[PDB]
Symmetry: C6
Subunit: 221 residues, 6 copies
Amino acid sequence: PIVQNLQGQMVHQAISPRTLNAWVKVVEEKAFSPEVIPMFSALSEGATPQDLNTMLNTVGGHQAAMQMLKETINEEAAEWDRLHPVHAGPIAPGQMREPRGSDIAGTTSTLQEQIGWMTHNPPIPVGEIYKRWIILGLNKIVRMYSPTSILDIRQGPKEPFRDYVDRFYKTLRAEQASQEVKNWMTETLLVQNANPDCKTILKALGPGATLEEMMTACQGV
Amino acid sequence: PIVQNLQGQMVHQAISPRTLNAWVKVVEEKAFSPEVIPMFSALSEGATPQDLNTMLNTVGGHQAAMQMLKETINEEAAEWDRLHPVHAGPIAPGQMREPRGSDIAGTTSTLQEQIGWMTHNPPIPVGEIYKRWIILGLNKIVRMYSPTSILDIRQGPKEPFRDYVDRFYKTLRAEQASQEVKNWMTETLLVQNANPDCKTILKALGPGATLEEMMTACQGV
Amino acid sequence: PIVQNLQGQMVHQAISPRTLNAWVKVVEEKAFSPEVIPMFSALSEGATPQDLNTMLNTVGGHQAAMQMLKETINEEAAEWDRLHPVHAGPIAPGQMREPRGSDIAGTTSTLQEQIGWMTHNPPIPVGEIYKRWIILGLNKIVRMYSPTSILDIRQGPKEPFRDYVDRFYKTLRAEQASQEVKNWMTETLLVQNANPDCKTILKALGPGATLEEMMTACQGV
Amino acid sequence: PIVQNLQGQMVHQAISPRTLNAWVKVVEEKAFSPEVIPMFSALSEGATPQDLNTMLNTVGGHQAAMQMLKETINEEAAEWDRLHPVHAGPIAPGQMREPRGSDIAGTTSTLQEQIGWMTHNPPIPVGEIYKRWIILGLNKIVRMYSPTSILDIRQGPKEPFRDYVDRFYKTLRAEQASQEVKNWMTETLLVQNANPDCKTILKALGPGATLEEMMTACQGV
Amino acid sequence: PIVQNLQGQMVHQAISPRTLNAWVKVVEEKAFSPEVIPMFSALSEGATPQDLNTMLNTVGGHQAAMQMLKETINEEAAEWDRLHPVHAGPIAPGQMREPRGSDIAGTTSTLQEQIGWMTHNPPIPVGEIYKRWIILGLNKIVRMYSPTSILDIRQGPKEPFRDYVDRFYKTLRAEQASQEVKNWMTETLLVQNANPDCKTILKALGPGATLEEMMTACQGV
Amino acid sequence: PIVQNLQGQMVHQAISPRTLNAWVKVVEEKAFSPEVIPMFSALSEGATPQDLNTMLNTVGGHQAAMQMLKETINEEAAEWDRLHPVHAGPIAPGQMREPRGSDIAGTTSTLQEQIGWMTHNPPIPVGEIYKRWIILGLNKIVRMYSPTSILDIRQGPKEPFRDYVDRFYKTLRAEQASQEVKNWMTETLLVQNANPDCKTILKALGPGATLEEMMTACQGV
Ligand SMILES: CN(C(=O)[C@H](Cc1ccccc1)NC(=O)Cc1c[nH]c2ccc(O)cc12)c1ccc(Cl)cc1
Ligand SMILES: CN(C(=O)[C@H](Cc1ccccc1)NC(=O)Cc1c[nH]c2ccc(O)cc12)c1ccc(Cl)cc1
Ligand SMILES: CN(C(=O)[C@H](Cc1ccccc1)NC(=O)Cc1c[nH]c2ccc(O)cc12)c1ccc(Cl)cc1
Ligand SMILES: CN(C(=O)[C@H](Cc1ccccc1)NC(=O)Cc1c[nH]c2ccc(O)cc12)c1ccc(Cl)cc1
Ligand SMILES: CN(C(=O)[C@H](Cc1ccccc1)NC(=O)Cc1c[nH]c2ccc(O)cc12)c1ccc(Cl)cc1
Ligand SMILES: CN(C(=O)[C@H](Cc1ccccc1)NC(=O)Cc1c[nH]c2ccc(O)cc12)c1ccc(Cl)cc1
């Protein structure tokens, strides 16, 4: 990450050993479960592209996922370049250049070059931009590596309602969808796929009911 | 959380790796037991809304609970908006806007926007306000996920009094109630549901007696 | 705890994650054994009332003990109020009020209000005062939860003297008593309840003898 | 690593105990798997040659690897000396000398001498240069210690496609090759060595297809 | 321990959670083995008397040892008072008093009073003085709790010489003695109590020989 | 270690709890294996003699080794004194004295005296000098405690060449020798003691060959 010198030359801050270790263990224990993402995100706050690649480099295994991820990164980088075309040729001595897609992703850019973009008036936050791309990729991986669909989540004859909701919302968090879409799945599937006894109860509460209410309503049954 | 630059531009402070890890393990080990709340609260002191969502995002499992929690968050946000209506249209260049319910909760607001509200003369402490909402929600979850009622806590024939009190006060901490209500449960249930031998002793101490006294009184028996 | 800004506005310092964790594990492993107290005390140095309640809130289980503790806290708070009566009515705009028993204990006082009292010329150290109350309560709990009395500590026929002393001093540390009282128990019980063979030796050293001497004297036997 | 004094004499910063420990455990758990390198690299950011040797010295076992590594280091040092020949004889009192290959590698140079080179206007980043050499060596070790070739990675009759890709990309990361070469292996081997049923599917997607697409295409089969 | 404010009012520094934990675990794992002392000493560098008592308070068990330790502390405190008699009566408003034996040990002195003594021109280092007393006591405990005497350390018929020396020097470190005395035990016992075969070899090296030499000399045998 | 005050009086920095713990565990797990030394060295960077003795004091067991180590320390101290003779008698009030061998080793010198030497214009780096002595001693211990000689390292009929090299270089690192000597052992033993099949291959590569080459050459066989 970045921080200010005594003299106020802007200076890079090495990633902590325990930030590194955190990220690795996360991955070893949790694979690509949706919570992985807010964690990757939280451990990389302030990161430059170099820092972000470091972090990604430290994952061993899961190399299929990692490759999809680069594909995702290339698609965004291409798109960046299309919306921000580079004026080429000579470069004005000492002054900074405009980052291409590759420069953002860290392939074609030095650390020194990166800090330069990030700490500018006005600042070009290349680390933030790269992180969006990564997280977009991380989402795709999560969706792909999810064993079941929201459509196949039905409540068991003997399943307490709390647990059915737990699997519905767990699965739903892993899905490909806008908020409009998730609402629609909630609104359509959740009660439609409850078990008979509790479904009757819930038809009868009508569609203003809170979860807290639905759950309490189906507690005794 | 937030802290002051060398130049005194107010700057965000990334959440520690061990704060993150703390919170996760808490949840894995203790579920929603009442002590979870003072811990969530203690690990989020100084937090912005982003920080608070991060923390919440890092919980995997318990997704029913998490959804009730959002419901709680929406109810408070709505109520906020009702008591603080936004003047809309154009916004004065450079100056900050008035946070809506959604802006407080972090849905419709940037980190930069948040720090801005929090560090103002006078400061609009959006992080503190969001935390109230969350904790209100966390309480509801705790109550709901409590296996037994204060009414069913009776002292065993062979139960030492210390243990009965331990279950009474454990259960009571999980209950829905003001202080007026808890006092009333204490004052009515605690002795009424002791076991025969010790109940006699306690009728005989009368209602000024301390716990220390009650416990000592029923020690030998 | 508290610390000074760059600008020297006095500012609150969030409790460390590892301070929190320390305290919890202590309690899980050691219950209310006398060493718990110097540890609670050491982990709460610099604490405000809020900090102290946080810490207390994080204990799950032991809720009987916790309730005795509040009782203890109320008794001290009442007594505080009796010796420091509050002048009521309006309050002078901007200036601080005199803390009541409840304000010290954190029930009726904000963090901001607390720091205000603590960092005053001259400082009203409300955190220190609350901590006395707590520790007084913690002592009562320790005494109460001690399985055996100093009177029942006798040396075994086959018990090395070092071990008997170990149980005597362990038990004695858990007892209700001034220093005058502990001395008297030492001076009366320790040798009176040694086993026959070693008692003879010790009668014969006379009452100026050090522990080091007594122990060495009864080493071979 | 290096940091600035109160007086701004540039001063060495001892390696953290947990940086040390990190590196050792990495090696004990992961041997020379490709992820080792980004980790060595991340734990040595800011390092001087001394720091880098320290770190290398702390590995026990793997001494064959360590010797190849020195060989690699000598080859680079020789080459350095060939492209940067030293003007010899007397040295100007007080002023710094030009580092030879050996001085970069830390054999013939003091810490004080190193900091001197690193913190110069303009700075001679000897630590960065040595690190390139090491990492070049570390790569060679990784390749050598890889049990299988990219050529022998075939998909099992019963192997899900995700797993085959996982072994292909794991093995490919361990290989000797430029990016041109890896692309060529990908482009030639990956589909050519899938199992029959899925190969047919993939011939039929044609060579623009993403991994995400290929994987999804072969999901049901 | 102690440190300087922004304003340079000298201020107390709370003991770290991990310093606390360190000390406790030491004791749980190692009892009173001689290495305990350099560790207690290393974890208490900079300590005030309060800090030192805290640390001592956190030991549970070993209460016989703890009592001998206080006895030791009283003997030193008495002696202090004899060599530094207090002028009594009124005290000059605001100025500091001369610490008695009890004030050094922390019984009769406040933290504020202690920092005052320690940070004076010239400084009265009460923490250093108390630590001497403690360590003197800790030594006595170590000696006492040592299972065997230097006199009973003989080399086994089948014991490698390295191991015999290991037990000799382990035992010798636990003994009551000046350096003059330890030298004499070394010089008299070490070879006199080696086993026959190796004793002959060693008589023959004569008394200038190093350990390194003695050990090498008896290697093959 | 040492650091600068706010006022720039040079001040001692207590050794971290985790530096202490690091060193102890190292020793418990790894005994005197050659990697111990770079670790002792890395954990003691910046150390004064006191700090270095502390660290050494914390080792329990291995007391034969520890005694050889002191012997080594005395030999160096004697030699120091011979090359730097002390002018004796009175000492100039306030000014510092010239450290003897004993003063360097910490026997006859205070911490305050040590910092004084270390932070002088020009600085007498007594901590660095003592550390050389120790490490010289630590080397001797390592050599002595090495179970096998470089001469007895032969490659097994069934031993992969990588493993034979691993034992050769492991053993060689533990040996008594200059670089001239190690080269000679390498150059003479390594191939001379390979197993028949691989020896033939290697005779045939001739003596310019790299390890990387030798190892690859004997891979299939
Ligand atoms: C911005 N934001 C979030 O990041 C919230 C923070 C939060 C998590 C858990 C409980 C409460 C809040 N996170 C999410 O919406 C992501 C999420 C977590 N679990 C899910 C399950 C299904 C789904 O579609 C999304 C999620 C958010 C905050 C408040 C609300 Cl009301 C909604 C979202
Ligand atoms: C403000 N405050 C609290 O947060 C106290 C702090 C505290 C916890 C444990 C022992 C002593 C004190 N916490 C509580 O009242 C919450 C609580 C903990 N256990 C309970 C059990 C039942 C219940 O209704 C509430 C609680 C508080 C402080 C002092 C008193 Cl006397 C009462 C409350
Ligand atoms: C102020 N103070 C304490 O806090 C001492 C510090 C200390 C603990 C252990 C060994 C030596 C010293 N602590 C105590 O007196 C509490 C205590 C610990 N074990 C006990 C066992 C019985 C008892 O009645 C009290 C204690 C103290 C210091 C010196 C002396 Cl001589 C006496 C007390
Ligand atoms: C500079 N850089 C890297 O260091 C990337 C960072 C990264 C790792 C994992 C997923 C995404 C990105 N790392 C690599 O290319 C090394 C690598 C990791 N796994 C591999 C597998 C095969 C291979 O030939 C190389 C690698 C990089 C960044 C973006 C792209 Cl698109 C490509 C490379
Ligand atoms: C001041 N000082 C010490 O504290 C040395 C430091 C040190 C420990 C271990 C190996 C080398 C050095 N420590 C000791 O003398 C205490 C000691 C450790 N093991 C022992 C075994 C027997 C004994 O009588 C004393 C000790 C010291 C330093 C150098 C020498 Cl040569 C002698 C002592
Ligand atoms: C100064 N220096 C060292 O401290 C190197 C650093 C280093 C360790 C491991 C791999 C590469 C480099 N360390 C050593 O030479 C000590 C050593 C480690 N393993 C050995 C095995 C045998 C031996 O005789 C010495 C060593 C060094 C640096 C570069 C070279 Cl090429 C040689 C030495």
